[PDB]
Amino acid sequence: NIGNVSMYTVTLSPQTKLAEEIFAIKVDIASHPLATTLIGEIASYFTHWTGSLRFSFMFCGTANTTLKVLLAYTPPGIGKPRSRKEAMLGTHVVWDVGLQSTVSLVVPWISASQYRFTTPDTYSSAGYITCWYQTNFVVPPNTPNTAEMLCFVSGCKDFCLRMARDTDLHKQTGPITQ
Amino acid sequence: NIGNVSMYTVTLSPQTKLAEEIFAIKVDIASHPLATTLIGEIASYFTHWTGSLRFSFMFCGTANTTLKVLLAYTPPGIGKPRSRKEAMLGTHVVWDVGLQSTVSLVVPWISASQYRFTTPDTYSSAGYITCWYQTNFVVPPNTPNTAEMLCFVSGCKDFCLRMARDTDLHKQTGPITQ
Amino acid sequence: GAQVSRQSLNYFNINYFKDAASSGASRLD
Amino acid sequence: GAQVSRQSLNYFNINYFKDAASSGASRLD
Amino acid sequence: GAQVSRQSLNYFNINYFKDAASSGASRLD
Amino acid sequence: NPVERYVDEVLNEVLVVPNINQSHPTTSNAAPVLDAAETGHTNKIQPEDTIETRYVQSSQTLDEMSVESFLGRSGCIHESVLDIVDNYNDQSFTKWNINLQEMAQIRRKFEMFTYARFDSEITMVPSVAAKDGHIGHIVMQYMYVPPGAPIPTTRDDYAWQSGTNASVFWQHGQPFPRFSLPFLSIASAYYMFYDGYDGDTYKSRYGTVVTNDMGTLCSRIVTSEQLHKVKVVTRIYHKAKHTKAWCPRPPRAVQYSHTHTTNYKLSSEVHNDVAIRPRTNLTTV
Amino acid sequence: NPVERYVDEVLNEVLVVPNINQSHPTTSNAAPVLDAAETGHTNKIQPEDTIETRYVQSSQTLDEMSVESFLGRSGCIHESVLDIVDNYNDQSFTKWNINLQEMAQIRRKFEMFTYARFDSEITMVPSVAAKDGHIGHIVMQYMYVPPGAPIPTTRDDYAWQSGTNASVFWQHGQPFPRFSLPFLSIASAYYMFYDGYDGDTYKSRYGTVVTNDMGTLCSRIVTSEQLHKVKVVTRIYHKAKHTKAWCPRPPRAVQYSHTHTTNYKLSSEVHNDVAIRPRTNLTTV
Amino acid sequence: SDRIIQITRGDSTITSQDVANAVVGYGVWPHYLTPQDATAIDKPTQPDTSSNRFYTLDSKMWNSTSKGWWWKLPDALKDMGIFGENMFYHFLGRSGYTVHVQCNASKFHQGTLLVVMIPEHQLATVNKGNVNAGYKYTHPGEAGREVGTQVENEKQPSDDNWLNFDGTLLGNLLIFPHQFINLRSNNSATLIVPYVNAVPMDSMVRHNNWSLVIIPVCQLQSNNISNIVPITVSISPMCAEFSGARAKTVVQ
Amino acid sequence: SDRIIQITRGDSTITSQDVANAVVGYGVWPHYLTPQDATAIDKPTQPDTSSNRFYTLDSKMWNSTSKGWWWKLPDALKDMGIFGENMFYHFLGRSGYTVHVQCNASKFHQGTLLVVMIPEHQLATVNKGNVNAGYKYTHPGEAGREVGTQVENEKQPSDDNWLNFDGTLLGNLLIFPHQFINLRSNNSATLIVPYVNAVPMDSMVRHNNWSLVIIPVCQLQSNNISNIVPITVSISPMCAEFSGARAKTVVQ
Ligand SMILES: Cc1cc(CCCOc2c(C)cc(-c3noc(C(F)(F)F)n3)cc2C)on1
Ligand SMILES: Cc1cc(CCCOc2c(C)cc(-c3noc(C(F)(F)F)n3)cc2C)on1
């Protein structure tokens, strides 16, 4: 997908098995795939970070397509949830698709220390965001059987970066000439 | 005894000869065996010391074991006492073992100069602490015929260290690696 | 060229050269 | 950045840089 | 650390370091 | 209080972040978590709205994240080389078409904005390599030749007189030279990007090369020819002071290839050209 | 009085010790000399209670015994070596995983506390050894690469641009470089000891290596290759400023063996591994 | 009487008619995290009396050759009722403790136990280079570790009681909150310690804040050795609070 | 908009953009036990946000032949995080609930679910004399009971949805707190019920206070039957409090 707009969308569709997993990524603001987002890129210019993260999702399907999904944040000290039931026990939002296309899940700052390292460091890995089918993707007849979803990220009022450093998300391996 | 907890205890028992000597050490806060105590270790980070020292002793025998002991401090300018009578002429405390397990002997600051060197230096050697049987170690039948005693040390309100210096109670003879 | 303050905590914001470009990093907000 | 005192014995506690880390050893107690 | 005098002839006896040992030669009598 | 503000500067507590307040369970038809990204606005929902939070007094400050701080660190922008190999007259002087586009690190940071206005602090780090053993007495001359001023063509060109241009003489052994420059543009701000040309024909130039001419930095070893050959490399460092930036933009995602242009190159496997790391699949953290 | 306190600083009489008062003969059923160490408290008996003392005005001060004073002396924490032997490009730069665990003297003092919070003063002492005769013009670059920042892999790596990282350039002949660092932890204090891991499996790391990552100190000889080879050794010195310590602990009793760990080694005759000197017997002073 | 003590925590009450007073570590009584020192923003859970109660561990047998015992908190309570449940369902935990060590014999017995509470007791390994104590070994649970028994393994911690299992001399442990159980004087020790750490809350699973060390400095002796003299430990969390709820963490 | 709802409990927030308002059983909002009504004298434990959060059960599949489903509380949450742990470590428990049933389809689907919360739903057996429903059968857990599937056993409960599984007519269930999920109007149902019992607190193990019954009264129909239409249940305890702590009870 890299090098194509599709790398930005997640596909949803009618399921035959219940509570299937949709996506899963680390919450760490500077880890992949969050790294190249604007907040991830800026975070990569600092050594420390703190604060709550705001993840938003916009359903791109038809107006007649319905869906209920469960978005969960798993605080650290445990592996990523292997099931919806396991994920649901943590911080989560049940998203009902309707007139308002977008939903937001806030990943509260839940850490032992006031700050964490922006670079992938064991001690300060902040947890995961997983997405699961709460009910199912349902459509009337003669309607596309799949739909896309866009995912956004930004920081909350308490987000903050510290200790300026050079980024490793960009390099120069030769002379830049005239 | 070094390398065993027994290096910290002094054994007492019924005597057949009167006024026997129990232990004898220099009072100098940084001399051996006082050197590795916390106050001795800290004193070893300075060049000068002054003030009164507090030596305490806790009887570890049975509740039915009795004993009277004489703890003495011999100010300098004379050799360590060769007998209880000789020691008793100096600063001392007669300790009676009873409900209160611990006794304290204060070694008052008795010096020509306001301070002394912490390192073993003739001119500033502060004297000795000796311990002698005042009466005897007595027990009823069917009771262990020996008992241990623990010895403590700390400084009084007038204790003070001066002129910071590196310690010779610890070294590095090679590289400390990762 | 000193912006002497008082409080006593007397602040002394000195500009050694006669050009604005010469002074150090700016204050915030 | 001077904490000018007076008594006349005028104390001048000066902080040459704008960071707390930059100043010398702290006062006691 | 300045013992500022006045008369105007303002004397400025400054001690640059925080130790008495650091200052220069003593005054007489 | 000009003194209370002083303390905030020393402690770096000028820009404080808000506290998190205690929140409670809710049941309402007001749903903050729901919105519409189509509007182009970011949902302003905070943690107190999605979970029951406790009260917490924030102590973080945004000072270090200020534009002044982000662009206020001295970075290398040029590495001038004077290498005496076999002809002192030809090799003891050189020139550079000034620009902030040759080094990726500082270039990327400035380019995170469309326009920027700032004064500059230039610091030079000269280092004399003794190729044959000694370095003798090295004295350097750096002269700023604004566009239009005569450019020296020999180590003794009359232009080195610097009757009007600013020149800085450095003597080996003395501290690193440094000076300040006021905002230099003929416009109100420097163009980090410029979607325009210097004409209207197929041969007109495109980009910032049209608006960012800064002149030439000429330099020479003042010291006359010496027995032992040296190689003097002067590295130039730049820092922005008293800065303002406008219209933030996406960070450079691929390597730079040339100055004053956003041109880039792509390989047959584009994932190698960007910092994005291939994921095994959607659910592999 | 901010001026009376000033005098105490100059004279070092901020923390005075109490006087000894005259005491007299006593006969009472209140026995201060008797107590119970089992309680875990130290008998607070003073000399006036065990002997008849005279009155004495104390003049000693505890200033020098303060934590600020104890940990406020600059000691060596690293000895960086750049030795040009046969390949300038490979040998003219190096890196160090920063830590305060490699030199026993300052390490032991900090480790007499469980937690410590302080700012740092780093002072560098570079010395250029002329292996072949001359040293030419030596210019050094020291760059702090915080965890995450790109680490240079060649003497000309773009990272040396230091567009954001702090770098200090020193020129041989100029005074020793020095700078201050603010308390750097993501926690409220540095862990001198840490009874924890970075996971919960048999392969998780144990100790301060988990909490004390400080990044890398990269350095290079800025000067390009010279005829005569040199060996530059830069010794780094550290000092704590504005210090606070918590929970004192037993001093290191055996030699250190590795960084971030309390591990130690014992010989077949342990009395040789500790400062304790064997006594002939209980009564031999 | 100053020889008697009654400690009530939750639904538990412990007594001793021969105490040597009590110790409050660093003179700070345990208290809940305040908003000025807190960092995690979700509302904490405070089980109160269902977690702040005395939990009695497995008793140990003290004999003439015992070299000592140690436990680590909160590890030792990982399987103790509600408190234990809470330390695994949450990422963060915070707690103080009341440690009551029990040991009685007779007025014809003698022996002395040094009871210590050490903050950040980072164990060492001996003659094993930079290999450190394995997670498994510093997480023995209520069973604790019996000094001088474990059949050595590479990742096994130091078992030298005279060197505090960490390269420091035993005689100086008194600088930490402590008490002695001198059979002739008392039959118990009581230490109340507050939460101590460089962060307001922490992982109860991967960070042991306190370590309880018990070393017999004065050997157990009597003329009735057949009568077993046990040592029993009862610990009660105080102001226990947890944060960052989720599924239950499973170790190993 | 009165069609939208957001419910936040602990660290969970649930939304629905097509609700039919909400119901508060008997108009009484859940609240903690007061000292005037309490009988047990030990201080209760109140997990607060670690227990008063939404727990999502296993989803069910609704099809043209579905006869219905039922769950019992607190049984259904016996294995749900801290709440579950608390109901087994204590003798007594007390809790209210926010029950949010979820079911979406399309504007071209039709079907109607009667969602009911019954207090003391004492199940019956059919044609089996005085033999009553076995403990095992009225304690199915989060899986609940699927009407019309279970292969009959002697102690198995009545499976007649038209007789409310208890000898009363379905049409009258509306006298209990309830809502309908009429596919053409809403995609969820929300019921908030207070603690209801003849005693202030009770055994969470042997007494199920409320029963959640879901019966499709209007059959599910559409011209796209292959698209599975699930029904999902999320329940959040409210003012959960427990008393009489001890070891953890193990059932069966
Ligand atoms: C956009 C934008 C803004 C700028 C200005 C870059 C600064 O460039 C310089 C430098 C590096 C040095 C001098 C300079 N002035 O005097 C000297 C001397 F001492 F070197 F002669 N050098 C002048 C300019 C405009 O370039 N692009
Ligand atoms: C605990 C504890 C606390 C610390 C901090 C040790 C200080 O380490 C350094 C040093 C020695 C130098 C720099 C440094 N910053 O800039 C430079 C430059 F000039 F060398 F680039 N060096 C940064 C840190 C964090 O390490 N362990």
Ligand SMILES: [Zn+2]
């Ligand atoms: Zn020469």
Ligand SMILES: [Zn+2]
């Ligand atoms: Zn030479």
